[PDB]
Amino acid sequence: SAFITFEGPEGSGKTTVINEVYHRLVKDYDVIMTREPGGVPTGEEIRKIVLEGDMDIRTEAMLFAASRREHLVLKVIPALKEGKVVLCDRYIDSSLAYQGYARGIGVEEVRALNEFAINGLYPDLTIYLNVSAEVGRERIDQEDLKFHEKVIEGYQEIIHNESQRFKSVNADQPLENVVEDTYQTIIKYLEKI
Amino acid sequence: SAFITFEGPEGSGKTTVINEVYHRLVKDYDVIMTREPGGVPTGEEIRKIVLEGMDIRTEAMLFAASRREHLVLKVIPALKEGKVVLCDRYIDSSLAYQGYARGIGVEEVRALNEFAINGLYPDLTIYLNVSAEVGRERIIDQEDLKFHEKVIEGYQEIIHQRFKSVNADQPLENVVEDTYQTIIKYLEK
């Protein structure tokens, strides 16, 4: 079993990449792909509160962490117990970069919150779709651009402090190459375990 | 302004105490009575999830999220107006109930709630210290009795500066008087 998360800003091609990589991995592994809330009823009700939110950033961060726990308990943990490879589109690192860094709560504060939610369940491997701010901008106002750059800056601060868990993939390449590198990184990891 | 929370297990006379203290303090102060979620839309929606539908950590994070919304949208605006806010249950209830009695761990729940309150600790906290036996009589099953006892043990650990322990085994008239005198001494100094 392996718990692999996918991370990146908007414009990294993350969702297109995970979809392709998953389609290729299904041919050789017992794998599922999910994201939060991912159909878990409580997480879906929490999602509705977030979308209906000038919500206080700490309340928003707690709602993401509550959804994360419900999705972890109902979907992720049972699949890992059945020996599956679990691919998850966004996890703890999205809260660290968005709520912690870009919104300014602080990465360390948001990490403490998320550690309460995940109760030790860190990913075995996190693929970071490393898109430059400029390529990201072109794939997508001043406020939206400032936020996008701050999300990228946050991910770089997180990856600098936890190098071993992450595998950075060049997301500035054509999408076919991003898919290939991510798939190869994953199979290299899965064949070692 | 003053932020005063009230804590205690069921059967501590907490409802009677807050209402009677409110009625006496309104003569001299701009006072409000509140409890979470306290009518804050988001908090009320979180409460519906809790009541109409759970993993204990998800539950703890929902109480904390409702706590933050009630603090930001109701408590802080009242404190800014110069109000005395009488709040029925706060951080200490999550520590005693989720942390201790439900078994998540007091330290884990404390960290969660410090994220939620971001330094906004009560100015004063009245703990209505009732014995399990007097509390049980005021309430009126084995699992419920043991849970009530665990809640009390949870509060004992928390209490072990803002805390003012009032002897809630006394008749309620005396519990009210002691609580009111404790609050006046705080407000007037």
Ligand SMILES: Cc1cn([C@H]2CCCN([C@H](CC(C)(C)C)c3ccc(C(=O)O)c(Oc4cccc(Br)c4)c3)C2)c(=O)[nH]c1=O
């Ligand atoms: C997992 C995670 C993600 N993200 C970002 C990633 C980029 C998109 N954004 C938006 C947020 C916005 C406030 C509605 C604008 C956004 C966009 C679409 C949706 C949807 O599912 O339709 C959405 O809802 C969700 C998603 C996941 C959990 C819950 Br609960 C609610 C939020 C959320 C964080 O910031 N932190 C995190 O931990």
Ligand SMILES: Cc1cn([C@H]2CCCN([C@H](CC(C)(C)C)c3ccc(C(=O)O)c(Oc4cccc(Br)c4)c3)C2)c(=O)[nH]c1=O
């Ligand atoms: C502030 C706080 C309280 N409590 C306890 C105190 C004793 C009562 N219990 C129950 C819980 C139960 C699971 C439904 C049995 C209970 C009973 C009635 C209600 C209702 O308001 O109708 C209720 O809903 C709420 C209350 C507050 C916030 C949100 Br959100 C939902 C929960 C909650 C904790 O445990 N931690 C805390 O931080």
